[PDB]
Design a protein around this ligand. Sequence first.
Ligand code: 1U7
Length: 351
Amino acid sequence: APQQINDIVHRTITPLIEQQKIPGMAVAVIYQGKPYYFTWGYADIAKKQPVTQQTLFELGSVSKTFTGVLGGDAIARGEIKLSDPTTKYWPELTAKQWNGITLLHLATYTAGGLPLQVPDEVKSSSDLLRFYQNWQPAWAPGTQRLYANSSIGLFGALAVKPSGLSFEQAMQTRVFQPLKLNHTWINVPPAEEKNYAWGYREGKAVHVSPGALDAEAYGVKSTIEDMARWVQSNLKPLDINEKTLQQGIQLAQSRYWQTGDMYQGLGWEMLDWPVNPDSIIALAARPVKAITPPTPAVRASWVHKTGATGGFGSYVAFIPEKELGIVMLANKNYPNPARVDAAWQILNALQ
Ligand SMILES: O[C@]1(c2ccccc2)CCN[C@H]2CCCC[C@@H]21
């Protein structure tokens, strides 16, 4: 690595690991299409397995960026439209509160207060239907944003219906494969278990538990290499040869709603660059302003997503205009502000 990148990364991440007692971490900085990798500590403490560039980490809600782009790809394929009513793809959803709730609302957490978590008791397709039928919105659609797995999760599930594919098959064939993300998984195969880090929560080794809509909302596992490739693909979508995927990426970074200084994309969230770092809670209900029509992807943006599972904490951010991106993968769920601080310190110094 160029010594500047080495120095800013080590000087930022070493203290972060110490302060947050992070067992293992991988970091990629992508500068002008070139990735630079850094690793520390342990994928598995008990077995003394180090973090490497091949270690799989649970991305948690960083998975929603994949779902948002898969949904964009389906729009580009002409399979769905964000303006479509939810009921067009799930006509069994007959309760009257669904009138007026579109795929856009689901994708952007603006349906009117869908809950953060799908309840553990919800297993089957018939359980899920019952859950959504019974849900009572707090707000009219398109008025408030409440971050929710039950919202974008449903979007992901409906977005792949016309394709005929399972969600996982659609993601593999339409997103992972074309982008050469060959060590990115919704389900980690037995052959890859040797590389699957344990998460640590209160000192105990843990992996994410199955749940409904897990694939769609928080179920992707990936390596620092594939995640760097993912960030670069989103940084520079015009290099992508597959037309609908290129377009889907662009759609996921369009600005659909504004709350405060943040703009909601599909999975991705965006702020204008340069950002006040200060500008970048279990439930936070925020009124949104519709951006009518959505602004196409703005190059001078800080585009990012945080993600966690019980034992993992991930973060990706990039700035198209500066050809600069970063991925931070850790096998402990440590506070989001520490992630953003570190990422901003690194990118600002290189920018
Ligand atoms: O820029 C590359 C890359 C690879 C791995 C991580 C980040 C970026 C390298 C050259 N080809 C490009 C091909 C298209 C995706 C990104 C890559």
